[PDB]
Structure 1
Amino acid sequence: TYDYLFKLLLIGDSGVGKTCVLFRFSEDAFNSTFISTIGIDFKIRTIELDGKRIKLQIWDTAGQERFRTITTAYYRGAMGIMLVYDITNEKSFDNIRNWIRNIEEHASADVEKMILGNKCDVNDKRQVSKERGEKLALDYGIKFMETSAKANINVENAFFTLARDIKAKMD
């Protein structure tokens, strides 16, 4: 027995931590090893939300351009997308604009979006200030959270938010 079924999508450059964010949230696990995703995968975790049970189907995409075509094919089904960058990698942040393009070009017009600056545990190598992240997301009308899959910061928050936000279009 479960009540709902939301399909979510993670996109962003290879290495920003999409799989770790998903694994944190799904398995409460974290791999330090970089094991690049091949094509596409998904996990399910059914959560207890607001007195109410919801099964989330979260699609994880390969960040490499080698699999770009494969991954884009999965955009139209998403009820919500995380655009992820790495706060320790300026270039991954610069690429957020391009990834916003593919969403608006291939997902549903009402798909709900959310930018995550991941690896916010790594202070000594921060290349993107939280203020630059927060104001970009304000600029796109997109919610913003800094996350750490490693430190388990705001991961549950991130998805629980995106899903209450989905639920809210119901109700």
Structure 2
Amino acid sequence: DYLFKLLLIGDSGVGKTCVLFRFSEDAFNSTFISTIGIDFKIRTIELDGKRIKLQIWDTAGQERFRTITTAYYRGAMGIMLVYDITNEKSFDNIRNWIRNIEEHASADVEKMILGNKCDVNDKRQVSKERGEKLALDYGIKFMETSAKANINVENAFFTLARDIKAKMDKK
């Protein structure tokens, strides 16, 4: 009875795709993100009684499909920004990606920062604290996660979807 269109963006090798496949609970590793730079997945969930279809685009920034990937930004209801806590420029860039969202996507879109690979603390370069401040500055939610250990992936989406729905039941 609801259909939310979601997008995952961020630097390459951040984990965006495993984040996805985890939440999509696909039993396979098989993707086109490597050889196309786009992938797609659905899941319907229940939020306060109702069935919610989630349509999750995974983009990989290749200029080969610049025009198509805008179509995803322009039509996205919620867009997760992902960095790798093991890698700084991924995080540094989170501003750059926000520029895009602001510039290519809609005015009221729902946003969420996802500091990924948290499970690996031994190679951590980005403090969690520093990440939540980034988020609060921009006034959007933040959440550390691990596609592999399975930490907070599901919570991230359910959380984003609640923000979306709540925004819609207001109107």
Structure 2 length normalisation: TM-score? 0.90
Q: Give the Å deviation of 1:50.
A: 1.8
SS at match of 1:159: helix
Q: Give the Å deviation of 1:170.
A: 2.2
Deviations 1:40-84 (A, max 9, x none): 221110112222211100110114566555423420000010010
Which sections of structure 1, spanning at least 5 residues, go unmatched?
A: none
Contact kept in structure 1, 2:14 and 2:83, CA below 8 Å: yes
SS at match of 2:118: coil
SS at match of 1:170: helix
Closer, same or farther: CA 127–91 of 1 in aligned 2, 3 Å: same
Q: Give the Å deviation of 1:126.
A: 0.5
Which sections of structure 2, spanning at least 5 residues, go unmatched?
A: none
Looking at structure 2, the residues matched to 118 and 65 of structure 1 have their Cα atoms a distance apart, in angstroms, of 25
Contact kept in structure 2, 1:6 and 1:55, CA below 8 Å: yes
Looking at structure 2, the residues matched to 138 and 59 of structure 1 have their Cα atoms a distance apart, in angstroms, of 25
Consecutive aligned runs of 4 or more in structure 1 exceeding 4 Å deviation: 28-35, 63-70
Contact kept in structure 2, 1:24 and 1:30, CA below 8 Å: no
Q: Over aligned residues, Cα RMSD in angstroms?
A: 2.2
Closer, same or farther: CA 34–170 of 1 in aligned 2, 3 Å: closer
Whether 2:147 is the aligned partner of 1:149: answer yes
Closer, same or farther: CA 41–30 of 1 in aligned 2, 3 Å: closer
SS at match of 2:14: coil
Contact kept in structure 2, 1:15 and 1:63, CA below 8 Å: no
